[PDB]
Amino acid sequence: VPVYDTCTVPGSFALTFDDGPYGFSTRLDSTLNAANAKGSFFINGQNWGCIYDYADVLLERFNNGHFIASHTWSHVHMNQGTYEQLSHQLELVEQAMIRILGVKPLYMRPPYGEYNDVVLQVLRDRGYKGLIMWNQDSGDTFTPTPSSAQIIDSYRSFPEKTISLNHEIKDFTVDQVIPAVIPILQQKGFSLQTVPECLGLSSDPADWYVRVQEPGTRDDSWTCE
Ligand SMILES: CC(C)(C)OC(=O)NCCC(=O)NCc1ccc(C(=O)NO)cc1
Numbered sequence: 379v380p381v382y383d384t385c386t387v388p389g390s391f392a393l394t395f396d397d398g399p400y401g402f403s404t405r406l407d408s409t410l411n412a413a414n415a416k417g418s419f420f421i422n423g424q425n426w427g428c429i430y431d432y433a434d435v436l437l438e439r440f441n442n443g444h445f446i447a448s449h450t451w452s453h454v455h456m457n458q459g460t461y462e463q464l465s466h467q468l469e470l471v472e473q474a475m476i477r478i479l480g481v482k483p484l485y486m487r488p489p490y491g492e493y494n495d496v497v498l499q500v501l502r503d504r505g506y507k508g509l510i511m512w513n514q515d516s517g518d519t520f521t522p523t524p525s526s527a528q529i530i531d532s533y534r535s536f537p538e539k540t541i542s543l544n545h546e547i548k549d550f551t552v553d554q555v556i557p558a559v560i561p562i563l564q565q566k567g568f569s570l571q572t573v574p575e576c577l578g579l580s581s582d583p584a585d586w587y588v589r590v591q592e593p594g595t596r597d598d599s600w601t602c603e
């Protein structure tokens with residue numbers, strides 16, 4: 379399975395967000411949508427909330443041209459897992475997306491940026507088309523953590539074709555950094571694209587997923603317990 383860390387489209391720039399959705403996600407998506415900016419979201423199943431509790435955010439995201447991909451169910455260190463454990467960690471996110479959205483993801487980003495040959499083999503066997511890394515880190519999960527002002531200033535020098543790592547579980551990323559950096563990036567000529575678009579893969583959202591069935595209605599299976 380191909381590994382990607384840099385966009386190819388001239389002028390493109392990918393704002394990407396891990397570990398969500400979260401309690402600030404409707405604000406984040408409103409900010410992106412107001413600027414016609416597209417985000418790439420690498421979601422968990424049970425990590426900072428249960429994916430089924432975020433079904434409405436997920437449906438908005440899915441229907442507004444944002445890219446949704448897997449970050450594993452439990453945010454595991456994938457190099458420590460057996461083939462079977464990793465398959466289960468991916469399957470569980472696939473199943474949530476099937477129930478909520480009717481589709482399976484075709485892409486994923488490994489927690490901690492950690493992957494090996496077992497990970498790549500599982501992704502191949504499960505039909506994934508790519509493993510998505512990044513090439514600039516906002517620093518929003520560094521510890522000690524840089525200030526929002528510092529992170530915004532770093533964004534002023536991230537070049538074209540950046541795939542930037544952010545975490546939407548950080549309130550200041552949603553409320554301070556992204557509202558400041560969207561105009562910085564758009565006004566200097568960058569196109570805020572999803573990762574598949576910026577890789578010269580498809581710009582059609584339907585090409586980022588595999589349709590399985592019609593979206594389900596919430597029932598007692600929509601649980602992480
Ligand atoms: C147990 C918990 C989960 C609390 O934290 C950790 O152990 N962190 C280990 C940090 C690390 O090794 N490298 C830097 C890094 C890059 C990307 C990601 C990631 O997954 N972004 O979404 C995480 C870390």
Ligand SMILES: [Zn+2]
Binds near residue numbers: 396490
């Ligand atoms: Zn993560």
